[PDB]
Amino acid sequence: GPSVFLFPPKPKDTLMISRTPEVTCVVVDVSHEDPEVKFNWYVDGVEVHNAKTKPREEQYNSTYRVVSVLTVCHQDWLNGKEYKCKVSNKALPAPIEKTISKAKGQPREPQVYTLPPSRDELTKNQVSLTCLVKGFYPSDIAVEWESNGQPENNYKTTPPVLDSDGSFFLYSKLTVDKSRWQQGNVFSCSVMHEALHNHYTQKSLDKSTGKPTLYNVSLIM
Amino acid sequence: GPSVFLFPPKPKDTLMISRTPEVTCVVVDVSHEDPEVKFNWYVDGVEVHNAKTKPREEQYNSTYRVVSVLTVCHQDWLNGKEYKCKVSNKALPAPIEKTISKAKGQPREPQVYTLPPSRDELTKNQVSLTCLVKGFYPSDIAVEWESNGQPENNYKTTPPVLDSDGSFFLYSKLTVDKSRWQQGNVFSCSVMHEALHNHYTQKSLDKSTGKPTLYNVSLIM
Amino acid sequence: GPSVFLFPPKPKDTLMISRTPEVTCVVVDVSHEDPEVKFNWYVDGVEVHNAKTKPREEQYNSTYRVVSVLTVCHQDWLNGKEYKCKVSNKALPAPIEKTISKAKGQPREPQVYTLPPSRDELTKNQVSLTCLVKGFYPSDIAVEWESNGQPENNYKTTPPVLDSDGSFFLYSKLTVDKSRWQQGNVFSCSVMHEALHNHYTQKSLDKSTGKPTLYNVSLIM
Ligand SMILES: *[C@@H]1O[C@H](CO)[C@@H](O)[C@H](O)[C@H]1NC(C)=O
Ligand SMILES: *[C@@H]1O[C@H](CO)[C@@H](O)[C@H](O)[C@H]1NC(C)=O
Ligand SMILES: *[C@@H]1O[C@H](CO)[C@@H](O)[C@H](O)[C@H]1NC(C)=O
């Protein structure tokens, strides 16, 4: 009857400290005649019952969106511990189990190059800052933006694209007020990837990124 | 029960006169006992005979795949003509009428900007050239790289991504060797979208464009 | 009789995800008459028996010095959760309970400024890079040196010093060869602090960071 959908945690809440990691073993299409879904967890074999019991959520099509969330510590998740999720349901003929861990494979150091806007874009009242993050592995990666140590929110991030060499790459455009950009403000693009040292790196740009030694040869007629 | 997958025309072919759109209805999962299938084309309810049928190929799973392509006028697709492929077979109780047409989404023109590689990437053996396309609507765009008219092959392109203004945007990275880059080869990225004037535009770069040094001329009065 | 010194994890380990933090429960002046040691740990009163105990060793003073390493996850120490170590020694009148936790107080975001080497440094073969870090709170902070994504080891860091306004400040001197610094090799300062956004900040520092040399040419014909 009911099916099971397993979701690995996002890179954001497992690659950095102040957001806890949590694996999302979800059960779907649980009908009204068997609302009980039992949550059992294994992390590299040892049974753990510290998961939080999210109560059942009804659905429009008379099913159940019941979610099992397992609290994790970051280091062991980085070690690829397998999450055996044991779920037993009355309409389920047997206890259905699913497994997931860290996406294995040789990690690649994500080279981060932050590119300035093109000169022709400076005509428009809004300006775009781009952050190429290329040559990484796996696709688990997050990119944010910040200026003066405070995050920005008018940015978007394109999904990763497979590269020829077996790596991946992605871009992220931060659109800000052009007035804030011409004032010499500094913008820094943050990259959180497992291969990085301390699982974090940063690069920055300013208005005066490409510039000689201030040869301000100005002609007035 | 055989099913039909309908191919919309590629945006590049619809928006380029030299190329041509190919609306195609694809018939799959046809048992070998009854591979006789006929297609009835109705362009706004008009039976048309121009359809061409390619040779059929057997699938690995002991089913058959008989295909029929249809070259079409550019204005007919650009004006949202209703396209119907009526699939008839002895193994289907009812004909399949899948209709395909272009959307009426108010098209907003893009604003192509392309950026030279960052100074950090100049050290690596290969540089990356990005052709950002921003602000367009709808999401049908093909981006092509080339140098001196020869279309470059080794390049990738991110899928269109929604923005905060309701439009779309995308990038495209070209894997060009650093040795070819430093000689100043001129590379041009091509943007093909229906909202453009003539439905085509391009931007070309060189080391001179976006050079790290810039004599700040400030020709003012 | 025997005494107990309790030590917190080093700021680097608790401040970055790459390493592990340990709360140390040292027992000193442990006589050979009753070498019995018992290690208990309360995490907000929650007993945990995951601790690792190193074997005993002999000092100059005819006693052992055993320790109790306790491996914890970073968010728990960063949450201010209380920790306690109980050691039951027969000679002492009662087993001694010692508590430890995060140094509380309103967090202050560190401000990072990089100062290029003085004009007197180019005479010597090894210039000094200074990463001023000031105006933060509390004194748990790690500073590392990175060049093109790789750490440097020829660096030192002053302990935090009380400032005028109650905050702390510390510097860090990275010694590089004058050839590398004069080659335009990029250098940046990494700061691990609990009050920073994503617990990380970086500041670029180069020859181009200095050398403003306003070359202001004008022509008013
Ligand atoms: C350079 O000249 C321009 C044009 O006169 C002026 O606006 C600008 O302030 C000058 N900058 C410097 C650093 O002298
Ligand atoms: C470069 O020239 C432009 C155009 O006049 C001017 O606005 C800008 O301030 C100049 N840059 C510097 C650093 O002076
Ligand atoms: C540079 O010179 C320009 C005119 O050439 C002047 O407007 C500007 O104020 C100067 N900037 C300085 C001296 O910083």
From Swiss-Prot, chains A, B, C:
Glycans are attached at N61. It is found in: Secreted; Cell membrane. Changing Y64R: Impaired ability to activate the classical complement pathway. Residues 1-205 are annotated as: Constant (C) domain. Changing P93A: Impaired ability to activate the classical complement pathway. Residues 2-101, 110-205 form the Ig-like domain. Disulfide bonds join C25-C85, C131-C189. Changing Y64 to D/A: Enhanced ability to activate the classical complement pathway. Immunoglobulins, also known as antibodies, are membrane-bound or secreted glycoproteins produced by B lymphocytes. In the recognition phase of humoral immunity, the membrane-bound immunoglobulins serve as receptors which, upon binding of a specific antigen, trigger the clonal expansion and differentiation of B lymphocytes into immunoglobulins-secreting plasma cells. Secreted immunoglobulins mediate the effector phase of humoral immunity, which results in the elimination of bound antigens. Immunoglobulins are composed of two identical heavy chains and two identical light chains; disulfide-linked. This is Immunoglobulin gamma-1 heavy chain. It comes from Homo sapiens. The chain holds residues 239 to 443 of 449 of the full protein.
